[PDB]
Homo-oligomer: 402 residues x 2
Amino acid sequence: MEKERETLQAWKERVGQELDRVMAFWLEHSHDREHGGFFTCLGRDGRVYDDLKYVWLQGRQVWMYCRLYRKLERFHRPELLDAAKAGGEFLLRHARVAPPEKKCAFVLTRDGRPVKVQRSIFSECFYTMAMNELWRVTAEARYQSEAVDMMDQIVHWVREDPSGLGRPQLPGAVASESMAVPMMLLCLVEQLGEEDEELAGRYAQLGHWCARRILQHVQRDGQAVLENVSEDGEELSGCLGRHQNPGHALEAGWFLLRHSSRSGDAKLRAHVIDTFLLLPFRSGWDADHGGLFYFQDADGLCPTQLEWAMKLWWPHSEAMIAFLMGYSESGDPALLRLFYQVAEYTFRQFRDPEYGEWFGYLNREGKVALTIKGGPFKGCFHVPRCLAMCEEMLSALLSRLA
Amino acid sequence: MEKERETLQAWKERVGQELDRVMAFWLEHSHDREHGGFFTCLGRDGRVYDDLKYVWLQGRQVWMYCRLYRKLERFHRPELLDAAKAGGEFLLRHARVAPPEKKCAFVLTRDGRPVKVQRSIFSECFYTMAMNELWRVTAEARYQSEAVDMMDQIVHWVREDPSGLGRPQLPGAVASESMAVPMMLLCLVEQLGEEDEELAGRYAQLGHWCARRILQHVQRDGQAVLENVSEDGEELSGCLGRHQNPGHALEAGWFLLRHSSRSGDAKLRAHVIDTFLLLPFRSGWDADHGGLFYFQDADGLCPTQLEWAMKLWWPHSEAMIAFLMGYSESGDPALLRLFYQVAEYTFRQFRDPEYGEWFGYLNREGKVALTIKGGPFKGCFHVPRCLAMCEEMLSALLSRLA
């Protein structure tokens, strides 16, 4: 129908042009030509307000650059590959703290000297993501070895020895799994298996285990997705067990959708849309001012985090992907409508048409709380990945309406 | 440029949809689910009129499929993947006649038996492109080995021992080089070098050599491109020596553009444009009925080939790519206009706006000469490739002009 088609073409045009714009911001402001890597502590105008290198964002930016370079012809330029390679080098040299050991630092000084180390696998995950993409664009085996080796390091750490990360558990701390873990691991499994039967086959068992774990966070007879649950998949008590993050449930949701799409498993896909897309959104959406809450408490109690009611950029970018994907997958037009809802709200609320890129932090009412375009937790990732994926999905959708 | 970004969007939309259409044709009619491989002998309606498998086109199709699969998201579907793999397996099992040796048959029976062997390298050339592409989408090393091993064999055949190709030398035969050899060689060099720093550097010199040979076909002080020249890059006599093909000149032209795209030589770029684009078009375009002549004689003598005046699909598909790429590399409007001129003519004359895909043979008047959509020399290549590239090229142009 013309109605549908025109709206999609419009949106595909909107996100595509936006990607060009947000990418332009990172291309002209975040490149550290003197030491390699990127500056993410960028002000509203792109001015660097700090020269620290947050490992997460470096890995993410490298992956993003490569990803675009090989998927979107308009991004197949040397500037991207040069920056991406210079980024991988930086990671290759300084990412690791004591660099036999694979444990990576959370943040490094501009020159690559470790400043902080986080007892998690997050820096490492993005490290392996950037490594694998660099290999995809240069075919240099050293990148894939770095990637696969780190991957196996992470698997071991997560499934066989939490020790390699530190923080021996106190007899009082409850053994709880954070959703981010299976999600990230699953993300990796998907990243590596992409166009690689060997790797896809190698981590098949892990991919399943990961999806299964993520599903274990669906609690209260399928009425709540809980950020944390016991290692055995049971609801925890206290603020810890009641903690919710809608933005995260949606992201896990689309990660799961991606995992099952190939599995032509409409059963799983259905359940995921219900419990990971609609439920979180319905609970998370702020009826009074629009936008998804950052945090929530399953029992409806006031969250403990000061910033729970803030509207952050990534839960929305992830909502856009998850809905467009769910629709692309089930054709259920309700999801298309939700995508439109989320997409209009975030495009209207987070974009900064003055300088480029998007603000990442708004107060509950949707007003800009922080003017920074990048920082300790915001880089060239969530936004550009969301725009790229939507652009792709739309392109594919308008190909069946034509 | 609003006055221009319009037709461009128009064309990008037209080529993308057309590509969807032509691809749909091949996907639904060409697959051989019994012995693998594709049927290229299809009538105007997709009906098979012969089950012979022409190695050239078999390799071209497996190449096309994979290329689309990984570069255009909407084609990133199982159908294309499984089909290309079956095509590749088919090629792996029968392309080679004496399957110790590397010589590939020219035509095989539906089940893979050699029917005829062309004393050339073309079959092997496309086998190479198909295997390399199969590597890029499965990461299966066996495919890459097959590719590189063949590439090396081909190089030997044209640079060291052409005798392996067979074809006895005769005292009256003049030693000559046909532009198609350095052309196919350069095409393979660009192909293998894609996102592969190793192979890129490894064949870098050969790349430079081919380009040089090709350029050696420009004669009469840049006033003519000759299909055949002596090994010494000198004009031969007779019909052979004056033989021209505006389609290959234009093809060579963009091959060179892509190649020297890294170099950046504006002097060479201007040259290739002038002699491989404007020249072949200026003298090969049918003023009376529009369209590029198939063959022409450098001396303006009536060709000896019966079909010399026939308007074929691939000279035009190659012209669209060339002009568009030239405008992209030089920004000269004169070239953009020529793209429109060619694009308009080929879309209007070759498209079969009832069954899909294009007719490949029209009489000089532009009327359909043959109604086949595929045959001994027409497969899933020149059209989908031309469309896909123009799409990508228009996307990049629109993004920087917007």
